Amino acid sequence: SFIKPIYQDINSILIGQKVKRPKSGHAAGEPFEKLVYKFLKENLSDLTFKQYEYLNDLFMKNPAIIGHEARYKLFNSPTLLFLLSRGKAATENWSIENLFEEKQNDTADILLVKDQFYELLDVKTRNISKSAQAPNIISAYKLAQTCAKMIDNKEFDLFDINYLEVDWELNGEDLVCVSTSFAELFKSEPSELYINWAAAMQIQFHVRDLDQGFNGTREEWAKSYLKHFVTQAEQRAISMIDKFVKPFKKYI
Amino acid sequence: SFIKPIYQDINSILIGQKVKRPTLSGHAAGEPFEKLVYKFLKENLSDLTFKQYEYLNDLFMKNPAIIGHEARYKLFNSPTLLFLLSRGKAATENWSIENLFEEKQNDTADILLVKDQFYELLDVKTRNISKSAQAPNIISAYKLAQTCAKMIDNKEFDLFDINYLEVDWELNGEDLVCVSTSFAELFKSEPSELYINWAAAMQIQFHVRDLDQGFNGTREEWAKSYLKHFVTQAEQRAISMIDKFVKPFKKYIL
DNA sequence: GCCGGTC
DNA sequence: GACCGG
DNA sequence: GCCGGTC
DNA sequence: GACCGG
Ligand SMILES: [Mn+2]
Ligand SMILES: [Mn+2]
Ligand SMILES: [Mn+2]
Ligand SMILES: [Mn+2]
Ligand SMILES: [Mn+2]
Ligand SMILES: [Mn+2]
Ligand SMILES: [Mn+2]
Ligand SMILES: [Mn+2]
Ligand SMILES: [Mn+2]
Ligand SMILES: [Mn+2]
Ligand SMILES: [Mn+2]
């Protein structure tokens, strides 16, 4: 991680920050995400990007090459391409006068890049005024496809996927940050990631709870996740028949 | 529907109206047009318009002597409506006039219109027409399935309706404007053609604009035909999952 | 031209 | 994106 | 603690 | 809640 070396500093600047309640179901804690960026672009300016900002810069410094095929080559990693790139029509039609903008389903919120090593940073906000279920972290299926691509291309040293939880509570008319938490996906026991199939097949956890004691290599992390994923997939197929078919057959 | 009679009036008040922007998560973007629909309904169909939580508060305030969740749950007089409109055990019990219900992200309906013992569950979906996107989440197919089971079990086939209003908008300068609307009734559609997106929160998905309204059978028939479709698709999904999330990765396992 | 995954 | 439990 | 539907 | 297509 590139953030980790300064986590304490950004934990300091955030705790207490205030944002105004939205238009008196989704975001609303979003202003914090922007606050993180700003307070990351200041300390690690040359490393910090919005996912879309990175693609723009990358295509921008390659005026010679055009066409989607050539532009995808620019990624130099089947995995990163999968994880970070935009569609066929979007890459083809990119131009300095038609840049990529925020897309709702982008893998990362912040991209920190340094010497070909990418840290995919995802920001999560939490209303701590209440005990809620863990939020969507990332699609279990997307991870499955990443690991497989990592195994196929032996790309075990190209990127990390880290999270930052920012907790806030309502105090008056503003929302105020009261705590933060950092964690790395590839530091946890892949066998213990909870996959909520109904919830868009998302791995679900509270960042403060994600265990950080996995001791094997990156290749072992991916292999063990793929086992865990296939196994949970089979269980879910068994359970759906029990929760969605069995109790309703009497009506057919 | 209690709203179809005045659809033209709602439509004429939304089309063209600008609203100053807040990014625009899309969700945070349409919200204001929803405020407009509610407000409009509140001043024209005032005695029958309510936000789900608002109805619940009104419901309980009217029966102050009724304390404890069971007693308060009895106040619905309908298993189906209870299932679709109720707020959990702990919350129902902890409700007081000093601790009223607020909006819950989970609420089945955005707006609830009711008259003469009949309920209209109204959901208003917003759409950024500046793009062509996948059909949005309409309602959980699982919840619908349970709703049909309860209807059949209790013979409640003429108690409520589930309607959708689509608000189309776009970005024009420094503000959002509304460009068109659409209305449709869930129970007037062909249940067997409802598309269930299992990964997308097991939600029924369709664009309100569109969505057939030809079903000519009864509600009881609508319920059963849906249940058959739900069950069939779930088996189809159990199979797809092996074919898509297991079989293709089996080769990385040990 | 049909289908469905992701934040 | 992030929500508690009839 | 654990599990998992919905907007 | 509502998002397009490497
Ligand atoms: Mn909302
Ligand atoms: Mn090509
Ligand atoms: Mn966003
Ligand atoms: Mn979003
Ligand atoms: Mn994100
Ligand atoms: Mn985020
Ligand atoms: Mn009880
Ligand atoms: Mn709603
Ligand atoms: Mn609402
Ligand atoms: Mn709505
Ligand atoms: Mn607990």
For residue B85, how many other CB atoms are within 10 A of its CB? 21
Structure tokens at A10: 């950004």
Sequence-distant (6+) residues with CB within 8 A of B66 are B60, B72, B74, B75
**Range 213-252, chain B: CB under 7 Å to any strand C atom:** 240, 244
Amino acid identity for residue A97 in this structure: E
CA of A191 to the centre of ligand 11 (A): 22
Tally of CB atoms within 10 A around B125 = 20
Asked if A152 and A234 touch (Cβ cutoff 8 Å), the reply is: no
Give the ligand with the smallest distance to the CA of B107: 8
CA of A74 to C1' of F4 (A): 23
The alpha-carbon gap from B22 to the nearest alpha carbon of chain A, in Å, equals 7
**C-beta of residue B145 within 8 angstroms of C-beta of residue B128:** no
CATH number of A1-252: 3.40.600.10
Fold adopted by B1-254: ECO RV Endonuclease; Chain A (3.40.600)
Alpha helix (H) residue ranges in A117-217: 140-153
Question: How many whole angstroms from B225 Cα to the centroid of ligand 8?
Answer: 25
CB pair distance less than 8 Å for B245 and A144: yes
Identify the three-state secondary structure at position A207.
Answer: coil
Q: Verify whether the Cβ–Cβ distance A233 to B246 is below 8 Å.
A: yes
CA distance B62 to B34: 28
Q: Which residue of B has its CA nearest to A236?
A: B238
Q: Please check whether residue B4 is in contact with residue B187, taking contact to mean a CB–CB distance below 8 angstroms.
A: no
Closest alpha carbon to B106 in B27, B166, B59, B52: B52
Q: Among chain B residues 124 through 183, which have CB within 7 angstroms of nucleic chain C?
A: 134-135, 137
Nearest to A202 by CA among A136, A146, A147, A121: A136
Which site among B244, B252, B253, B254 would you substitute to test the A interface, given the most A Cβ atoms closer than 10 Å to its Cβ? Answer: B252
Q: Which nucleotides in chain F have some atom under 7 angstroms from a protein Cβ?
A: 1-6
Residue nearest to nucleotide D1 (CA to C1'): A26
* Chain B residue with Cα closest to A152: B252
Give the integer Cα–Cα distance in Å for A164 and A169. Answer: 17
Q: Do B238 and A234 touch (CB under 8 A)?
A: no
The answer to whether B189 touches B205, Cβ cutoff 8 Å, is no
Q: How far is the CA of B15 from the centre of ligand 5 (A)?
A: 32
Helix (H, G, I), strand (E, B) or coil at A137: strand
**Helix locations, A15-98, DSSP H:** 30-41, 51-60, 68-73, 78-84, 88-92
How far, in Å, are B36, B57, B59, B71, B96 from residue B64 at the CA level? Answer: 32, 11, 9, 11, 9
CA of B241 to C1' of C2 (A): 19
Task: Tell me if A91 sits within 8 A of A68, measured CB to CB.
Answer: yes
How many other CB atoms are found less than 10 A from the CB of residue A213? 7
On strand D, nucleotides with any atom < 7 Å from a protein CB are: 1-6
* Nucleotide showing the shortest C1' distance to residue A130 CA: D4
Q: A191 CA to chain B: closest CA distance, Å?
A: 13
Q: How far is B116 from chain A (nearest CA, A)?
A: 30
* CA A154 to chain CA centroid, nearest Å: 21
B183 Cβ contact list (under 8 Å, min separation 6): B1, B3, B4, B7, B163, B164, B165, B166, B208
Alpha carbons A243 and A202: distance in angstroms, whole number:
19
Q: Where are the domains of chain A?
A: 1-252
Closest of A138, A150, A152, A228 to residue A190, by C-alpha? A228
Cα A247 from Cα A249, distance rounded (Å) = 6
Experimentally determined by: X-ray
Selecting from A30, A141, A151 the residue whose C-beta is nearest the C-beta of B252 gives A151
What sign results for the dihedral spanned by CA atoms A16, A20, A21, A25? Answer: negative
Residues of A with CB under 8 A from a CB of B: 22-23, 25-28, 30, 102, 104, 141, 144, 147-148, 151, 197-201, 222-223, 226-227, 229-230, 233-234, 236-238, 240-241, 244-245, 247-249, 251-252
CA–CA dist A27, B27 (Å, integer): 9
Distance A167 CA to ligand 11 centre (A): 18
Contact pairs from chain A to chain B, CB under 8 Å: 97
- Which ligand does the CA of B165 lie closest to? 10
Provide the residue type at A83 as one letter: L
- Helices vs. strands in chain A: H and E counts, helices first: 8, 9
Q: Which residue reads 């349409």 in tokens?
A: B30
Distance A238 CA to C4 C1' (A): 21
